[PDB]
Design a protein around this ligand. Structure first.
Ligand SMILES: Nc1ncnc2c1ncn2[C@@H]1O[C@H](CSCC[C@H](N)C(=O)O)[C@@H](O)[C@H]1O
Ligand SMILES: Nc1ncnc2c1ncn2[C@@H]1O[C@H](CSCC[C@H](N)C(=O)O)[C@@H](O)[C@H]1O
Lengths: 281, 280
């Protein structure tokens, strides 16, 4: 199944009997729940992507692109965009480019095996940088943000979805560390959107352990898929207990704001993010 | 002198403080003079502290009064070109003479130009200042067209001005502020609500008696007298929440999606940072 089916989504309330695993893998045949799965995932992505006028962008860098679903989708939407993805695995890189060529996106959309904490991307600067749950999988976050910010056009967007570690316990990063990573690299938050409870809702499955075994024995999954799914369940429990938050960061490269003020406005958004529920709907 | 007559922010009302008595030295208290000046600087610095002026080349103050603000910025940052617009000739002459006394000539200029219509000197500025100017201008869409088109991409627009709430200078509702900014590609970084703190600064239970004492002791112009009465009335309106007084920190942004730009401008106009909660 496509990797986009296995990403987080936002649910406004828990849906009794909804299992993200069963639905994604079609063990639950309901076309209505399949629609809800996809809608919840697009709704999460669109909080970030809807901020950017892509008609004024030339290039996008997804610095941990998985199987390149996100940049393939953007590429089919916006025929003029160069989109470049980075991944650490050769499997994802080969499978991504096979998808890219199957859709005829070979000129504009590329996937490279490059370590975004160290390796420069293809362009000297990008108009948009995407990182959906990438940064907290990277140990050397300062080197990463040095690399991202130096390849972000002035006024360009950095769109992140990632975890914040609260008074509690993957490399998890506290609010101050997020403020310092953004502020010291000239990245100014336009908005932070807190989707913690809605992602917890999406991930909630009272039958997770039994559904995972049914997936193992019926469909067959890899050791790495199984462990990722167990980690996702655990993330949902952490979000419910508010040990972690899951936050959508809309930031821009800004070399002209004063550093003391930049810290202030980044603190405002990390510490008082817009709650997803109050924000729209 | 003219800086002394601007709004300031007071965190609480101060019994016996009269902004008029203090500004004109009828109240001789040295401590109250320093409070007046501190309150006025604190209001201005909420806006000015957002900008790294070392990375700016040029500033446009589109209603500069007697040019006190751009003169002060010019003496702080020796490399800046600063251009002021005013509608009045005595304004421009007095400003230009004050600029020349400081040796700021050439670098700091004041022109008699109508900012709602007339282009400024530079094709684009890094910072645009407007402290209580926009609501004195009738043709606001023309004005914001003129300001935005002469604002460098990513440059700052720093405004201090009123918002008309359910209630009654041309006063502009929250939706009109959102539309003026959004339709001209101006994105709010922050709005700071200083309504009650400016109300505190303006509060003078003896205003009418103090104004007469000013008229009869010092002597003031018809223009000044009316301005001071209007300031007292603004304070009363702010106390009643008929108007708000808000500090807008905005930037030119051609790359944000228009629907999202309206959303984030609404966020800040409708839920500005309260000055009291904002710093400690
Ligand atoms: N240091 C690093 N440099 C480049 N890519 C990295 C990286 N660390 C992790 N990644 C990549 O980032 C991804 C982290 S999980 C994110 C998957 C992707 N966002 C999706 O929706 O499918 C993985 O694909 C991994 O290959
Ligand atoms: N349409 C217009 N174009 C240029 N200047 C204008 C204007 N309308 C008003 N002004 C100027 O804006 C000022 C209005 S109030 C003065 C604000 C001043 N910056 C201060 O706080 O001290 C006056 O100086 C007036 O000359």
């Amino acid at each position: 199944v496509d990797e986009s089916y296995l990403t987080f989504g936002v649910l406004n309330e828990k849906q009794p009997g909804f299992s993200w695993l069963r639905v994604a893998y079609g063990l639950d045949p309901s076309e209505e729940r399949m629609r809800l799965l996809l809608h919840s995932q697009r709704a999460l992505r669109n909080v970030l992507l809807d901020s950017v006028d892509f008609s004024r962008a030339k290039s996008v860098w997804d610095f941990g692109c998985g199987y390149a679903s996100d940049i393939i989708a953007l590429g089919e939407r916006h025929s003029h965009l160069k989109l470049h993805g980075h991944t650490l695995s050769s499997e994802q890189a080969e499978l991504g480019l096979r998808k890219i060529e199957a859709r005829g996106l070979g000129g504009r959309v590329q996937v490279l095996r490059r370590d975004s904490s160290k390796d420069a991307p293809l362009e000297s600067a990008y108009d948009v940088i995407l990182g959906f749950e990438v940064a907290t999988h990277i140990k050397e976050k300062r080197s990463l943000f040095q690399n991202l910010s130096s390849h972000l056009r002035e006024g360009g967007f950095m769109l992140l979805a990632d975890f914040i570690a609260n008074s509690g316990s993957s490399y998890n990063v506290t609010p101050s560390q997020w403020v310092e990573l953004l502020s010291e690299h000239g990245l100014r938050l336009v908005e932070c959107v807190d989707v913690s409870q809605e992602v917890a809702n999406f991930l909630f499955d009272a039958d997770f352990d039994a559904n995972l075994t049914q997936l193992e024995t019926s469909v067959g999954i890899s050791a790495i898929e199984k462990r990722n799914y167990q980690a996702m369940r655990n993330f949902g429990a952490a979000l419910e207990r508010k040990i972690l938050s899951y936050v959508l960061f809309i930031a821009q490269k800004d070399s002209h704001v004063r550093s003391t003020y930049l810290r202030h406005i980044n603190q405002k958004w990390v510490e008082a993010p817009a709650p997803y529920a109050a924000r729209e709907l």
